[PDB]
Amino acid sequence: HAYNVEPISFHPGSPFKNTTPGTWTNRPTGNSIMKTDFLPSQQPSGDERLPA
Amino acid sequence: MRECISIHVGQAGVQIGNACWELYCLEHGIQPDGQMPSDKTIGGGDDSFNTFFSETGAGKHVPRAVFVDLEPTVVDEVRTGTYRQLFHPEQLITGKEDAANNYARGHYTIGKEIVDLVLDRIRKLADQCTGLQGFLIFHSFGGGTGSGFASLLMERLSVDYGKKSKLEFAIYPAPQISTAVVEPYNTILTTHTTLEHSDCAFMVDNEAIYDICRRNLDIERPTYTNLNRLIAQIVSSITASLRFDGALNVDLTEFQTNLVPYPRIHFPLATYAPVISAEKAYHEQLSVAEITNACFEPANQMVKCDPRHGKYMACCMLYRGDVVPKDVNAAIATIKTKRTIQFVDWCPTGFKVGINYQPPTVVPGGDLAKVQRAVCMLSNTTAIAEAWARLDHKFDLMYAKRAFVHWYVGEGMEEGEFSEAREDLAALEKDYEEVGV
Amino acid sequence: MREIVHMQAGQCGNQIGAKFWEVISDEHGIDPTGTYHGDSDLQLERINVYYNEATGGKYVPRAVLVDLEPGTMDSVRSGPFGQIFRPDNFVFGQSGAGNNWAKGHYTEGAELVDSVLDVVRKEAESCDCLQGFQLTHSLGGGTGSGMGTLLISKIREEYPDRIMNTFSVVPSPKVSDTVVEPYNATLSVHQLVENTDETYCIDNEALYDICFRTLKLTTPTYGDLNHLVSATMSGVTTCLRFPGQLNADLRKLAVNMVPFPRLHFFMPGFAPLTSRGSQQYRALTVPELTQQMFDAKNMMAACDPRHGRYLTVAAIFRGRMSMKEVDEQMLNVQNKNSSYFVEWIPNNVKTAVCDIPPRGLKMSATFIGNSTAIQELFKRISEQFTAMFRRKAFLHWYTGEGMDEMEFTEAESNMNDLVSEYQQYQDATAE
Amino acid sequence: MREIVHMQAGQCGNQIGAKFWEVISDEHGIDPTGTYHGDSDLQLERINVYYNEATGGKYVPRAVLVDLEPGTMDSVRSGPFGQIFRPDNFVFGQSGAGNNWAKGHYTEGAELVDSVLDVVRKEAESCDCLQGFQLTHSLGGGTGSGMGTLLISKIREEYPDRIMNTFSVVPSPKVSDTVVEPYNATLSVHQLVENTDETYCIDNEALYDICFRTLKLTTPTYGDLNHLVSATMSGVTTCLRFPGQLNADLRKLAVNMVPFPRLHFFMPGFAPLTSRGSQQYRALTVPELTQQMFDAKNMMAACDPRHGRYLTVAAIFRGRMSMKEVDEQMLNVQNKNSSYFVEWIPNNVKTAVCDIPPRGLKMSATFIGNSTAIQELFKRISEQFTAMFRRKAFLHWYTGEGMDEMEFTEAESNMNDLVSEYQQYQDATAE
Amino acid sequence: LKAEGFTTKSRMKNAVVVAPPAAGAFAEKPLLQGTSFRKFYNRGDFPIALEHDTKGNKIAWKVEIEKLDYHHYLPMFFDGLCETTHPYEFFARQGVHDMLEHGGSKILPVIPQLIIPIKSALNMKNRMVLCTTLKVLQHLVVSGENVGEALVPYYRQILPVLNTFKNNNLNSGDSIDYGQQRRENIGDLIHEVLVAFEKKGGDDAFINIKYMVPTHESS
Amino acid sequence: VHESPSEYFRVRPVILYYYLEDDSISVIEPHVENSGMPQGKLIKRMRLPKNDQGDHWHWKDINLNINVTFYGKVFHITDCDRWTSDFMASEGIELNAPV
Ligand SMILES: Nc1nc2c(ncn2[C@@H]2O[C@H](COP(=O)(O)OP(=O)(O)OP(=O)(O)O)[C@@H](O)[C@H]2O)c(=O)[nH]1
Ligand SMILES: Nc1nc2c(ncn2[C@@H]2O[C@H](COP(=O)(O)OP(=O)(O)O)[C@@H](O)[C@H]2O)c(=O)[nH]1
Numbered sequence A: 001h002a003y004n005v006e007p008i009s010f011h012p013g014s015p016f017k018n019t020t021p022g023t024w025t026n027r028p029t030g031n032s033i034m035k036t037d038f039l040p041s042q043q044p045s046g047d048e049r050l051p052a
Numbered sequence B: 001m002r003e004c005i006s007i008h009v010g011q012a013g014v015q016i017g018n019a020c021w022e023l024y025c026l027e028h029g030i031q032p033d034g035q036m037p038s039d040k041t042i043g044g045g046d047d048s049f050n051t052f053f054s055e056t057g058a059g060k061h062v063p064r065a066v067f068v069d070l071e072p073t074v075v076d077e078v079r080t081g082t083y084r085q086l087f088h089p090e091q092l093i094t095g096k097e098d099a100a101n102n103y104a105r106g107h108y109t110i111g112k113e114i115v116d117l118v119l120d121r122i123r124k125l126a127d128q129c130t131g132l133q134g135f136l137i138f139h140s141f142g143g144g145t146g147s148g149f150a151s152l153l154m155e156r157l158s159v160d161y162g163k164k165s166k167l168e169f170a171i172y173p174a175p176q177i178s179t180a181v182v183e184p185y186n187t188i189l190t191t192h193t194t195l196e197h198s199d200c201a202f203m204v205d206n207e208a209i210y211d212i213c214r215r216n217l218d219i220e221r222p223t224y225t226n227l228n229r230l231i232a233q234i235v236s237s238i239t240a241s242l243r244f245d246g247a248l249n250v251d252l253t254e255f256q257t258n259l260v261p262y263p264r265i266h267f268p269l270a271t272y273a274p275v276i277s278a279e280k281a282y283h284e285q286l287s288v289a290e291i292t293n294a295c296f297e298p299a300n301q302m303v304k305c306d307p308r309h310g311k312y313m314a315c316c317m318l319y320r321g322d323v324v325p326k327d328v329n330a331a332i333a334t335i336k337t338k339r340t341i342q343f344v345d346w347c348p349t350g351f352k353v354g355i356n357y358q359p360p361t362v363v364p365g366g367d368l369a370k371v372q373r374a375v376c377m378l379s380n381t382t383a384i385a386e387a388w389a390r391l392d393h394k395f396d397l398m399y400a401k402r403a404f405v406h407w408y409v410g411e412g413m414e415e416g417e418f419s420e421a422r423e424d425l426a427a428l429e430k431d432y433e434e435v436g437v
Numbered sequence C, D: 001m002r003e004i005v006h007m008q009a010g011q012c013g014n015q016i017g018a019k020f021w022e023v024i025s026d027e028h029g030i031d032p033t034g035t036y037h038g039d040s041d042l043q044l045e046r047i048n049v050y051y052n053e054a055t056g057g058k059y060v061p062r063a064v065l066v067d068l069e070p071g072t073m074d075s076v077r078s079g080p081f082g083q084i085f086r087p088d089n090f091v092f093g094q095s096g097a098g099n100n101w102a103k104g105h106y107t108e109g110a111e112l113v114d115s116v117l118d119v120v121r122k123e124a125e126s127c128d129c130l131q132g133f134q135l136t137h138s139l140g141g142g143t144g145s146g147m148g149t150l151l152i153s154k155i156r157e158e159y160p161d162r163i164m165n166t167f168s169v170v171p172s173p174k175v176s177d178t179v180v181e182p183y184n185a186t187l188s189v190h191q192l193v194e195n196t197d198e199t200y201c202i203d204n205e206a207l208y209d210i211c212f213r214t215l216k217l218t219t220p221t222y223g224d225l226n227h228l229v230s231a232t233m234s235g236v237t238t239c240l241r242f243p244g245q246l247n248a249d250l251r252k253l254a255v256n257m258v259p260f261p262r263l264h265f266f267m268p269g270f271a272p273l274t275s276r277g278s279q280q281y282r283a284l285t286v287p288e289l290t291q292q293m294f295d296a297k298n299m300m301a302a303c304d305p306r307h308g309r310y311l312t313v314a315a316i317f318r319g320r321m322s323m324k325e326v327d328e329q330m331l332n333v334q335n336k337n338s339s340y341f342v343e344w345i346p347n348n349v350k351t352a353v354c355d356i357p358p359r360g361l362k363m364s365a366t367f368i369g370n371s372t373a374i375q376e377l378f379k380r381i382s383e384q385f386t387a388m389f390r391r392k393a394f395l396h397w398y399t400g401e402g403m404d405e406m407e408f409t410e411a412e413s414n415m416n417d418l419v420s421e422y423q424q425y426q427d428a429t430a431e
Numbered sequence E: 001l002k003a004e005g006f007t008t009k010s011r012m013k014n015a016v017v018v019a020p021p022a023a024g025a026f027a028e029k030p031l032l033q034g035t036s037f038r039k040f041y042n043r044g045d046f047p048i049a050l051e052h053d054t055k056g057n058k059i060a061w062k063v064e065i066e067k068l069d070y071h072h073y074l075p076m077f078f079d080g081l082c083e084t085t086h087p088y089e090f091f092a093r094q095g096v097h098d099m100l101e102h103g104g105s106k107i108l109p110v111i112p113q114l115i116i117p118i119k120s121a122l123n124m125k126n127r128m129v130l131c132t133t134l135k136v137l138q139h140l141v142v143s144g145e146n147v148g149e150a151l152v153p154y155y156r157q158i159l160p161v162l163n164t165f166k167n168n169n170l171n172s173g174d175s176i177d178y179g180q181q182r183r184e185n186i187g188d189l190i191h192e193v194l195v196a197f198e199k200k201g202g203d204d205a206f207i208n209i210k211y212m213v214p215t216h217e218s219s
Numbered sequence F: 001v002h003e004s005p006s007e008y009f010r011v012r013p014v015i016l017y018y019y020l021e022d023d024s025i026s027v028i029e030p031h032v033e034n035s036g037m038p039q040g041k042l043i044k045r046m047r048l049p050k051n052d053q054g055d056h057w058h059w060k061d062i063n064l065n066i067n068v069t070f071y072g073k074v075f076h077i078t079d080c081d082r083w084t085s086d087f088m089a090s091e092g093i094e095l096n097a098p099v
């Protein structure tokens, strides 16, 4: 009774077994706004459909 | 052969540069790695990138700009971004300490170790060109790096390259919205030390862009990218007459001879107003009269310093797209007939028209839509005296109790400089009063 | 690249540091073995602020652990994330200074200050650049206050320009818990006024009230209390470890929140705090975080922020958010509660937005307020001190390890002078 | 974007509101968990009237549950669609109401009133229009009567211009099951007549009559009683929620049914309501809905409308139907029963049609009737009040709990003035 | 609607918030119990008496001023400055002003003691006691030899109220100030305390003076 | 062990202690001589988690030759005690031979 779960997100404790890679997680780390917004665009290739 | 050297001081300047260089690459067809696609093309001619880029011979379009910030974070996230390969690694200059919203740290202790290397890179970029048009400096009045280091580099550039024109795209503090606490102190100090070394200083207000994005683009949650893309549209509209071709034109030198009446009054406003989304872009005619009327509406100003409280001195009216030289004349005539828009009595001829046939460039994922015409106004109004008066009142309230003065006094900055900045601001105050009466 | 070296003194300080190095290791993806089992490169790009690369893949924290009871070192090593720390950085005495400021400051604890200065010097010289010094301790104990104040004095006289934050578990009477606690608090605040660059006053009573009322939580123990303390310790320095929009480091916070060189006693706060049942029945938005910051319920200092005026309030938001929403919400807070903010400062709010939230949360924020209501805590500690010092109770110890009553009078009068300065800047007129 | 906040007070109020929220949830395609498992876009076009968005795409009702005895929250959570409510809206006391208006009004309900106003302000700040408030309670208990009237008074003091509608349950001399019902109803209608924009009087005797003769149902029970009341509560705001040819919101109904300010006591009515053996013999047309609306046995209150004058009649028709047919069915009933309508108000029927019928119902229609026949209930309660007030029976509880005999006399006098005003507008002539 | 701040009541379209209670940093703080100048004097000792005069009076000393012990008498003569029920106020202030001008080197050793009576008088904010205390401070520093340099550690603790009340002058236009003879202008007396500190102090005095009062600057 | 001239890997002896009163686990080290490393408690008495779903280590899934992960440390069990073997066989585990 001297150790509880965390009081912020109430997520249960983990045994920290790395049997799965670090990408496979249920609480991933966020991403930067500049990375999410400023993205590489796509060029018009030419073999598209004719627009109306 | 024309060339514009961009210096991006501070986090605000670097993020605005990250928007504007993205816009430049999109509008010139340059890919983020640096090469042209070489399988498709967009068409600008063989020389409509030389104002901002250079050819290495191999086909690498390395751009200009002297991206600088004392803290490492924003410079390294730019280095680890989409445009990693575009920029020269020596262009992106950074330090270790942060000025931490301190003009004293930006101007006296932390900046001076990096001023020399920034000046050397600026000298290399100036030697790389043939005919230099001007120095486009992107910063915020803000605090620390954008306030102190920008002023120190401005002093060094005035010593070295005296006759070259300088533009000072700057984020001016909002009337009610504020982020920093010592922002009035930094604003007054950077104004005092940019007054004798500026050539023309453009003001942009975050709160006014917030309300414009809410009213026009219909977004209630805008971030800094949605503001910096509008600022990118501003700078592109200003310097597109150098790059593209058209009707009656303008380079950077007329922006001080047709917009600065006296060598104190060099703070025009910025007003782009075909600010419309794709939901309502094709359901209305974006005619020249409509867009110029919407540009002289005070709700579309990006300073929130309402021009009905003062009188206009000069208006540099830049048009971009399918703009007729008689339609612009009719719009200016029918607005000069209006009595709500007031001009000073000593400037009957209060306009400077400049037209390009290039349509505005949209950004994929951006908020704006594709429009036939665009208007950017540089209005030098006497209404900005109320914004100076408000920052003067804030400076008086802080400096009366000597709050937040111990940092500046203990790290550089003999105490009389605060009173120097205050007195020069009051001189500017009733200078505006005397040129208004 | 900016580095911060962290230090924990006393039993409370060591437990808070253990929870802190659990929480930020969870933030940075550090295995309790020491390895990086992370997911993103931004999680490693600025890991050098608190960690240090060990050859083999381990990440040694830049933490120094201090006590004079070796049982505390055994407990912090046997805690979870206990093998993380380097055993050289476990400097301990044998006497157990144990709720005696005189023993922790002048006698046998002062035979350990040279060794801890040596190890702190060794950890500090291995940095290309340095921001400052982090300290966690309690003001109601001998090791936390005695060696804490001695260490702050020594490191301040050695490194005069590098900044220094202490996290100052300041006593409360409704938890009581120690007789000589007012003596220790009064003798610690005297040095924390002059030496510490910035300090955050934290009350266990306020933490218990937050856990009972806002978190329900039934049984909170000390794990949840140290978890809120570690959360507001991690939220302050997130601009030094993660990038984003408009950000403020420790020096920016100190510059924008310290108007005069002594008014640096702040009030922390962390406010996406909800109960377990009322977790998914919520919509995380900037106005409701602003709700939960600007509330007397969710402040980790047992003094009401309404019998006084806010001088400077900073909020470090975390999440992919809207700067218009942030500025509009806090400007609205200023205008509508304009009576509780000093009017000789036009804008009393600093905002720092970092777009990378803590793991598991979409949205969070950290409150740091510099109120004039800290005079309540300082006046209650001063009145307890003068109640005990009127009859000179429990003073034969503190004069047996070799102090004088003039020192106690000086410390009391300095704290009274700080209270008077807070009162002056609270009641000062507009112009 | 017109939103209305729901309050449900008492065991009767909570049991009616649980069925109301169940009906709303399976009409809007919401599961017990809160996720939208619906089909049409109209189910989410105006979901913000009753629901608030949370994380994960989950809708939480904009309702507060009020009681003093805590077992009704356990009953609500035992009921289906019990986990959909937010746990912070479960505002419950700990002791018992005592079936005492004084206990629910001037004591511990008056100590829970600050918390329930706190949560009501919290749920009302999350609106952009805030069209009004609806409250479900009974005039028989202490939380339904006293705490409900105190809530009405505080809401009227706070938001004076917004509309309030209370679906109040009135006692009956045939049902009873309480010996202090005359005192409670007499004391509660005094506050109802002065601080409510519109109120619907529902009688358990009339509910049982509807369940026994129009439904031929063996064991009716409170589940089907609250089913009928909940169908009425939905039908009065389906014009707000779903689109239709004629739109009539709560303010529309208030201005079209209230000639004089203390004449807002309506009796409701629902159609169609058929038994098992009457399903074959059922011509599913607008005329049978109109007739079943205007029938005296189908009234949701015990009053016979033939013993009075219909001031105004409101007809909310849900479903796919005409305008000529609906208007001629409103015309012909007036033309034949012109003796039961007031002659000093011409064309005194308000007609609205919503295009969307309820789920599993091809057509439906909500009758609302402002008549002078409602005064039978007030007469009954007033004379039952004075019969046991002549000897001051059961008055020692109220007087020792903290009321006044002057307050009792003034409440009875205001009830008699309400009855006299209904009588004078019943027998008032045109010229 | 009246509301307490930082809550849902505080944020309404028609609600106004209650102002915080003032902490009273500009108000008087009268004693709950008299000093050791009402306990030691009417009990006996204090070889002083009134010789009567018109301006004030004069203190007749029955012992030599220069030979009596300043380690004993002086710090508890300063204890009598914090009252007003006067036969005592003249006996306090003129005792101060006499022993100081007729002392010598003896003032400097007792200076570390000479702080608690001074600060206690300062932390009462009586408008007639405070001017007397400032005029005592203008005479301490000029009284002996090397005396304004021993106060430099205690600039921390004699200057918390001079910060508060330095802006306590009057804006009375071109009206003649006839209170110039009876020097009772706190906002001025603080200024001649500070310039006297600068003049008869050492060289690291000013860094502490600006550390205390933010709007002071070099004389 | 990395970068050492005496060994490339080490084995640190471990004694587990499962307290049945509160289903808690404490690991201890038997303090070998001349180790040169700080030996002592190395995990105090608590309820050690087993899964990411909140489950903890019970005695119903502790046997002779198995691996148990505690905090990223994967201990492997070797042998029991006599009383512990008797108790575990009384409760019904198979006790699959010491190693
Ligand atoms: N339009 C726009 N303004 C920004 C942006 N980022 C920061 N600002 C403005 O910059 C102001 C803060 O000053 P900064 O220029 O960011 O200070 P800094 O460059 O980070 O220098 P230091 O404070 O020393 O770290 C804020 O008030 C913002 O208004 C941005 O991305 N877009
Ligand atoms: N928040 C928190 N407070 C603690 C903890 N442990 C002890 N304290 C507080 O610290 C005070 C005692 O200080 P202590 O750590 O013994 O100081 P020391 O004697 O110098 O080591 C007590 O009043 C406790 O309330 C803890 O784990 N968390």
Ligand SMILES: Nc1nc2c(ncn2[C@@H]2O[C@H](COP(=O)(O)OP(=O)(O)O)[C@@H](O)[C@H]2O)c(=O)[nH]1
Binding pocket: D009, D010, D011, D012, D013, D015, D016, D097, D098, D099, D138, D140, D141, D142, D143, D144, D145, D169, D175, D176, D177, D178, D204, D207, D222, D223, D225, D226
């Ligand atoms: N129609 C209906 N009436 C109810 C229900 N529950 C209780 N009642 C009536 O309400 C009266 C009791 O009121 P009560 O809820 O106990 O008031 P409270 O004591 O303040 O909670 C009884 O006379 C019942 O006839 C219900 O579920 N449906």
Ligand SMILES: [Mg+2]
Binding pocket: B010, B011, B071, B098, B145
């Ligand atoms: Mg910065």
